[PDB]
């Protein structure tokens, strides 16, 4: 868990993801499942 988290934030900063709520629902997700829905949603969004 302390390892997909921040690897999604970096890989939501590296995508050009300036979302403080993104970062945010990053440390709020508890679940793979949930980092996946985080980062899928904003990025589908971004592009």
């Keep these: 868990l302390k390892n997909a988290k921040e690897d999604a ?5 590296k995508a050009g993801i300036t979302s403080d709520f993104x ?3 990053x440390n ?3 679940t793979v499942e949930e980092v996946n829905a ?3 949603e ?5 592009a």
Excluded: R, S
């Design 9 to 13: 934030i970096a890989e939501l900063k």
């Design 23 to 25: 970062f945010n629902a």
């Design 28 to 30: 709020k997700a508890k």
């Design 38 to 40: 985080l980062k899928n």
């Design 42 to 46: 904003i990025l589908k969004a971004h």
